[PDB]
From a paper:
Cystathionine beta-synthase (CBS) is an essential metabolic enzyme across all domains of life for the production of glutathione, cysteine, and hydrogen sulfide. Human CBS adopts a unique multi-domain structure: an N-terminal haem binding domain (residues 38–74), a central PLP-dependent catalytic domain (CD, residues 75–382), and a C-terminal regulatory domain (RD, residues 411–551)5,11,12. The RD adopts the evolutionarily conserved Bateman module, consisting of two tandem CBS motifs (CBS-1 and CBS-2) and a surface-exposed loop (residues 516–525) extending from a CBS-2 motif. Here we show using cryo-electron microscopy that full-length human CBS in the basal and SAM-bound activated states polymerises as filaments mediated by a conserved regulatory domain loop.
We pursued the cryo-EM structure of full-length CBS initially using two constructs: one where an N-terminal His-tag was removed during purification (CBSFL) and one with a permanent C-terminal His-tag (CBSFL-CHis). Multiple maps were processed using both helical and single particle reconstruction to resolutions of between 3.9 and 3.0 Å. Both constructs resulted in maps with virtually identical conformations, and both were used for modelling. The domain-swapped dimer, previously observed in crystal structures, is the repeating unit, and helical formation is driven by inter-dimeric RD interactions, i.e., between the RDs of neighbouring subunits of the filament. Here the RD sits atop the active site entrance of the catalytic domain hindering substrate access. Specifically, one RD each from two neighbouring CBS dimers interact in a butterfly-like dimeric arrangement, related by C2 symmetry, such that the loop 516–525 from an RD of one dimer forms a clasp around an RD of the neighbouring dimer. This packing arrangement, burying a total surface area of ~1550 Å2, is stabilised through two interfaces composed entirely of the RDs. Here, main-chain interactions are mediated between β-strand 12 residues 516–519 of one RD and β-strand 8 residues 422–426 of the adjacent RD. This arrangement results in residue Tyr518 from the oligomerisation loop slotting into a hydrophobic pocket formed by Leu423, Val425, Ile429, and Ile437 of α-helix 15. The notion of filament formation increasing stability is further supported by the His-tagged construct that presents longer polymers, higher stability, and less degradation than the construct without a His-tag.
Residue numbers in the entry:
A (entry chain C): 421 to 548
B (entry chain B), C (entry chain A): 42 to 548
The structure:
Amino acid sequence: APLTVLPTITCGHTIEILREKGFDQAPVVDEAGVILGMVTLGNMLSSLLAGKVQPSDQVGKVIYKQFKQIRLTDTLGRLSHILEMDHFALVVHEQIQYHSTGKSSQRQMVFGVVTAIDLLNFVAAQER
Amino acid sequence: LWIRPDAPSRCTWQLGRPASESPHHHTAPAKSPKILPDILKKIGDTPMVRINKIGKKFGLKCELLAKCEFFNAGGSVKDRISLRMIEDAERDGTLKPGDTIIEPTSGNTGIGLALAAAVRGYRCIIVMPEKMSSEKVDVLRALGAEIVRTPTNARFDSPESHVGVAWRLKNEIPNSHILDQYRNASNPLAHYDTTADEILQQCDGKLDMLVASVGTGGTITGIARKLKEKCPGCRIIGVDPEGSILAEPEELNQTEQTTYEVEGIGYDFIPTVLDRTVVDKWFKSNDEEAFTFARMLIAQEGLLCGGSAGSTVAVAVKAAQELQEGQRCVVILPDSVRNYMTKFLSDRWMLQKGFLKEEDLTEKKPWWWHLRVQELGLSAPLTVLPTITCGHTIEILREKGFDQAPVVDEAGVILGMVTLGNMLSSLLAGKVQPSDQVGKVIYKQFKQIRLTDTLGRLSHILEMDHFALVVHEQIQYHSTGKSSQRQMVFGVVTAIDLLNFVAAQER
Amino acid sequence: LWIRPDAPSRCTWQLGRPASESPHHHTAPAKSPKILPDILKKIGDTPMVRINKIGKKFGLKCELLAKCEFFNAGGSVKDRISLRMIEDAERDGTLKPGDTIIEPTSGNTGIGLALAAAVRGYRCIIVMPEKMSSEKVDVLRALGAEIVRTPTNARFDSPESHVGVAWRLKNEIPNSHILDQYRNASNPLAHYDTTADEILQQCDGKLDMLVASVGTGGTITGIARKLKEKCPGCRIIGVDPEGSILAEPEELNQTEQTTYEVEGIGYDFIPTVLDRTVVDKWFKSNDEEAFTFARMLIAQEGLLCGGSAGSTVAVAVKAAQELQEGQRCVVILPDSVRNYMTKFLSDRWMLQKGFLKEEDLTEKKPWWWHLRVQELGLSAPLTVLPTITCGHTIEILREKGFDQAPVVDEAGVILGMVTLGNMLSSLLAGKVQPSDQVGKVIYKQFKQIRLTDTLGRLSHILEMDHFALVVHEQIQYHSTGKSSQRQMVFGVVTAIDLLNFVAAQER
Ligand code: HEM
Ligand code: HEM
């Protein structure tokens, strides 16, 4: 998940950055680090051609708001159970940043977006 | 005016003539005193080392011996000649105290002359091609010698070749002398007097084959002459790198390129001191096999030698095949590895030069070499600011059982690492009070790695740093113009963790 | 479970006791054979070299001698102990063929153990702090040893110190042994058996002062014990770098910083093998004087030694002041310069570290050092394209009398240089036909310099390249957005031109 976008970015802005680097999708995160959802290049193109959004419109209207957080340690079996209810499973990581053992803070970030397509491709490729 | 280095030798030596007819002043080797008046007396008496594994690896039935000449004061077989020529010039009155010495060299002779001059106060000017290593330049700078460089591909007859530049300098600087190792009889004479005698005494006067690399030709020339006078049965084998013309018959020298990485051997002309008539047979060698055999020598025999030694051994493993059990072979190892630290001794340099292939490098590696870092068990649940006090960190680490935690600033920049044990020891030793900040204990040195990297890259990193931090970078966009960068730490992997993982996966 | 390296010594040795009570297996030094079965036998019998100039420079009335231990196979005084501990482990049955050896070292002992293991097939794992030079890492990689790094500032009692990391590895890897030079009696025993005997025989059993650097403490400990048993009148002098606690009385160790660049000496704890009771007096030393004296040794005596040798000599020049004519001093030089090629041996590193000042560096330089390049007589009337043929260039150069001309492309990019003599020689040798392009003869290697630069910078450049091209850059503007770059060649200055200018201006 090399890059992420704030919800305020425009669809036209999002289209170029994705295509100039080839990524089909990017997570949406606010300034603090709260994950807001997932947005995909294909949907933006289809929506723009459908007229539901203009290139100047913000991505917040196209974002997918439903997803499930998962962590690296979880098994693929756990992931398969998750994928039966949500399309996107976001591999999040959490860190507690301390100042004086009283003033703690939490930080998080996204590193991979995995779907049933990705899982099946991994299984088929690794099956040797 | 100018005297060429390729001029035919005026020597009248021929096999069978008696030594009493020699115009030259031979010096009988003598036992040095228990205390050396100067470092220059630690030249000669070099050891003979039996090669144990390489001969078996290449099916040699004969005993293989190495004349490790890289143990001299200057680390070369060119210290002998430097001392001999300086002594002969002093004795003949050609060279006076405080004079200036100019010598065109490949670096080893320059180092020897610089050392002798520094000991004895002479001024030294070294003319050295560009391709020679920078380690020689550093050593010469330390010894106080002046260095002049010449193009690698310049022809010897050109006015800007090392010999030509030396000649031009001599005509300019007054009270200057050129010893001209390419023409001085002292070069081959030193070997004929000392090295051949050492070889014969160490071998008890019995040896069947001798292999030596050829530069100026003195090393092989004097040894061959003395041996043919004393041990006629010895076969003399010469080594000349591809791109040179020393080797005969001329059919061996047919090649398209004349540039080679090996240093100190091979020339575009026949030196005067080189007597090709005493060399029984010649072999050509290439840089790849030379460096491969040098690395093999270092790894299997402990001989810290250079590329020329590798070429010599590579030729010897072929030449000695004609020998049988009970016979003996001798190879001369000219110089040490000190002059090639950033050269073949470095894997990066070999890969850049193409002497090593990824297939060859990885084929010898363990099974886990290609696994990616993500397969490890790694986590960084918490991190701390540099401003937190020591005792506070002790509490937050002990309450959760973690032994270590990264240190990251407010903006997310990684500053280093801290460990519970180090802080506890410092508190016991009084180096830090509990209220003191962790910044006085944090480990500032670490290396960033990414999840996609292999375990081999991780090991290579760990050979230089204790902590390898698995860092991931995310770039956040606002309008394609206001980009921002974010990063976070996941796993701190050390050699301990990697070996524990290897052991666990091995069962 | 864990055994500390600072534990008090259980040895019961005291002056006057007879050797017959020693539990240890002493090895009597013996003459090596004329042919060494392996490189490991070339350890010991190191030379003693008289220091000639430094003593006079610092007003020493006594004879100063150097025990040059950097001539061993591994280039260190830590090869002796490596061999001795390996042999003792083999004899006692603790170590078996094919075993794995783990040793926490500063690099020299690691190199010795790696060499011995490669010769004998053992697996070697080296735990070395981060501050040690990369040359040691390269040598260890060549020898096939596995390398683990630890933080420089980690306390010895910490779990990630070199000793602690070695202990952790041993408990993990099966069939692994730690020789523990900090506790092994073999470390001091090797010196007590071989080095002290060599010193006594070389000195004829008469010496008044001995100066040695202190790391593990075995080198000084064994030598002092043997000398006090045999030559009680010798004063034992220890050297401990600033930032360490080995030196006593404790008043000498009061310093704010514990990080020092010198390698292999000084520790944050008292090793078990170190017997501080036999050391008559202690001296502290700093990195600056150590490296200064190492450079002075290299430049004035020809001894290619490291920083620890410099510290030892710096302390000796002070300690020996109490001596008078007819007395003798001995200093131990542990390691060679091979391990510090990019370190103090490099002027850039010293300037970066602050051990050298521009005032000191330039004060020794000639009068013309600070003159700017523009003061030279230099001109480049013509240049040629790479596509021109050889004969055409011969004609255009001979018709005007110029011997050389730069090569520049259409856009103005400099491609190198060509010379009349080289082309003529190539035509005579047949390497190029007259119709062939000059690109096969051009010198591709050159360095760009600017008119404002000094002649010292020019000389430093000339130590690495033959041609220094005086290039000037002009940037041409259209609208503050469409910038363009232009450059042109003025003067090709070599060492010949610089020395000719110096000679002309000297009259
Ligand atoms: C043992 C009987 C020898 C005789 C009768 C002999 C004869 C000579 C003579 C007369 C010269 C002077 C030529 C001149 O000044 O134009 C000379 C020079 C020389 N000698 Fe010998 N030599 C003998 C042995 C050796 C040996 C053993 C070596 C080497 C190991 C050697 C290497 C040389 C060389 C390289 C030169 C210089 C030739 C030149 O600069 O053109 N000679 N020799
Ligand atoms: C000559 C009479 C000597 C006697 C009677 C003696 C006595 C001993 C004994 C009994 C031990 C074993 C202690 C134990 O296992 O707990 C020992 C170990 C040791 N010996 Fe000696 N020793 C002598 C000479 C030397 C010499 C000449 C050296 C060094 C040059 C030396 C260095 C050591 C060291 C470093 C240890 C290890 C101590 C430890 O690990 O705690 N000893 N000695």
